Amino acid sequence: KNEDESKYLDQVRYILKNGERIDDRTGAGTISVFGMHSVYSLRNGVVPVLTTKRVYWKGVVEELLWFIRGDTNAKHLSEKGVRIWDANGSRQFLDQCGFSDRSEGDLGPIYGFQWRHCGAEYRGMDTDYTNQGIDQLSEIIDLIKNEPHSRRIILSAWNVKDLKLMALPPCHTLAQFAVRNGELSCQLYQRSGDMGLGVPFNLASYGLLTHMIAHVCGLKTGHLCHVLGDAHVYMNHVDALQEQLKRQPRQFPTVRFIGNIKTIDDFTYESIVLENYQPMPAIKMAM
């Protein structure tokens, strides 16, 4: 009945069977297919959070709220128990990326900064950037509200001039939104998708963001189209993914929002309620 999660599982099956064995930039073995497309229903509250292995929902929500704040300080995420960016903000990683003058935790002008302060001069994580640069997130909300049929509703983190300053170049590269029949849909272009760890997290993240924007704009939700460039499995995840592929998906959970939420900046962890998410046991996959 959850045919959408079966699509994700079939993508993994296709990569394991047909993918090319390539060593990546780190020397890590991967199995890769270039160019994959899948569609997930977001209708009637549904968020595509995989049921065949637990997704780090606490991490998904806190990371997304941190992006929306325009925050690039890994420490602020770590303080909420979410460590997923900590390695990239470490004294070691900063020095190794030639960011020796940066304070620990400073990831540079990554997603949050690009979403809210696009084109502003980055001067470190501790600077207040209020009103500096282009607030893409507010601009796309204004387009959805005033010109819902627009073909120009794009949220991009791929700031070429800023790539050299970023801890990592964006994997979730741009998202396009569209309104049909008072339903908000999203097409996510992901240049690089780790099918084991990254992609399930990223699908949950853009599913949730589409619901949050729809809520602010008084719209229903439609679908999330997921476009992959390098759809890959790490060789060290193959046994774990073979275990997952034996499992039959359950129905995806739904999300609902509580409180008076007027703008994209008014969401809190407590305002977001995930309903009927009881996944199968987590499967450990190393970095």
Ligand SMILES: CN(Cc1cnc2nc(N)nc(N)c2n1)c1ccc(C(=O)N[C@@H](CCC(=O)O)C(=O)O)cc1
């Ligand atoms: C999106 N993201 C950031 C991130 C940064 N660099 C990366 N680099 C690579 N090579 N691959 C990734 N998937 C990756 N992901 C994520 C998302 C989820 C988890 C995650 O589920 N972490 C679990 C631990 C999972 C585990 O490794 O056992 C946790 O409790 O923090 C980590 C990083």
Ligand SMILES: O=c1ccn([C@H]2C[C@H](O)[C@@H](COP(=O)(O)O)O2)c(=O)[nH]1
């Ligand atoms: O949100 C994220 C962040 C990272 N990655 C994975 C994809 C790649 O395996 C790696 C990034 O390496 P490059 O594509 O930049 O080489 O991390 C994701 O899948 N999603």
